[PDB]
From Swiss-Prot, chains A, B:
Transmembrane feature ranges: none
Protein name: Superoxide dismutase [Cu-Zn]
Listed result of changing C7S: Enhances formation of fibrillar aggregates in the absence of bound zinc
Compartment(s) of residence: Cytoplasm; Nucleus
Listed result of changing S135N: In ALS1; reduced metal binding; increases tendency to form fibrillar aggregates
Entry similarity comment: Belongs to the Cu-Zn superoxide dismutase family.
S-palmitoyl cysteine lipid modification positions: C7
Cofactor note: Binds 1 copper ion per subunit.
Comment field (misc): The protein (both wild-type and ALS1 variants) has a tendency to form fibrillar aggregates in the absence of the intramolecular disulfide bond or of bound zinc ions. These aggregates may have cytotoxic effects. Zinc binding promotes dimerization and stabilizes the native form.
Amino acid sequence: MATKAVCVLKGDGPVQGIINFEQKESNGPVKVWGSIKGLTEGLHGFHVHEFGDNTAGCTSAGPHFNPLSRKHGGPKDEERHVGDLGNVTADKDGVADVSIEDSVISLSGDHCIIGRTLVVHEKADDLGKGGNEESTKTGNAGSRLACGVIGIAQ
Amino acid sequence: MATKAVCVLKGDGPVQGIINFEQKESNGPVKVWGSIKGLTEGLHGFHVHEFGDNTAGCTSAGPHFNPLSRKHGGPKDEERHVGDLGNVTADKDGVADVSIEDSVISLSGDHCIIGRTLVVHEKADDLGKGGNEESTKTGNAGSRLACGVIGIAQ
Ligand SMILES: [Zn+2]
Ligand SMILES: [Zn+2]
């Protein structure tokens, strides 16, 4: 079906960005790339949450997109949420030049992320290896700095 | 698959609102309801545009969602874009209490509007009866006051 998507991230603070998604083959991986600025230096959790609902800001996006009812993990784990895209790294200038390729999310079918919410988080995702209950749900990535609904792009 | 959706309308000016979508059966009508504030009194074109792309504001959402390559019409016409939901009416307090039911838009399938952009326009939609070229494309509804990507709702 859809081969290109885009997401404009906004929030209450200075974090903002544009993230592109491209899936040339419906059964192949999704490329994810773009730039997020306004971030503190270092790692930031980068997740697709379940709902494309911004009525109460990023909170109403709900939890991680998890159609298979699994535990939070890193993108390379078998045990992961579909929305578990791991971390993005912001440099010393506050810019995260995102470049991710993922073969679990899709722009079509049951794992489709169109119309859900991409969220960039306050802290690093511990990829489910943090030893607490929060690690297996959110990776301890903390609060939602910016988000946007993932839309169909030209 | 998706039976509920939601859209948060924002723009450069004061227009803002929340629109809900609900489709109990995939072969059935979509109920569209909610509230838009900050509008001048009277009719405002109300359309699903093709792209869920807000990278340059509402302009990047593209033209009306039109997979059947038809001319613009009102919602009751057989010749209409899928995205042609006609007008909403703002009262003297600037509020449009939207309440629409449409069987051409869907929350699934070919006519799925999830991941596309809802736009509320500056002027009335002439429902394709204006007799100029613009009427058959946009209904002469004028500029885009506010928009949002339509996202999956809980
Ligand atoms: Zn997760
Ligand atoms: Zn139209």
